[PDB]
Structure 1
Amino acid sequence: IDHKADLAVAPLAITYVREKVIDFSKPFMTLGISILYRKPNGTNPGVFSF
């Protein structure tokens, strides 16, 4: 806003409110949400591992 600076390249989600007050170029790479998980391990319950 204050023109103390210019285009600010950094992690910057071009959201609804931001374009109201700033102008943003078209995104160079898309995003989204996924789940993070620890992949399973060979510790079979073995109550019945038959």
Structure 2
Amino acid sequence: YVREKVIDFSKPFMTLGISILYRKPNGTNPGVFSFLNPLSPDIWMYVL
């Protein structure tokens, strides 16, 4: 409507919306090291 005060517009073809585009890569991780991710290797040496 701000541009419509300056120049004329016809009837639009279709309404155009704004949406969000983002890919979803995701991924996997084995638990043999990620299961002990709170347990840092300094604490591994402390427990050893």
* TM-score, normalised with respect to structure 2: 0.45
| Structure whose alpha-carbon radius of gyration is higher | 2
Task: Name the structure with the higher helix share.
Answer: 2
Higher relative contact order (CA 8 A, sep 6+): 1
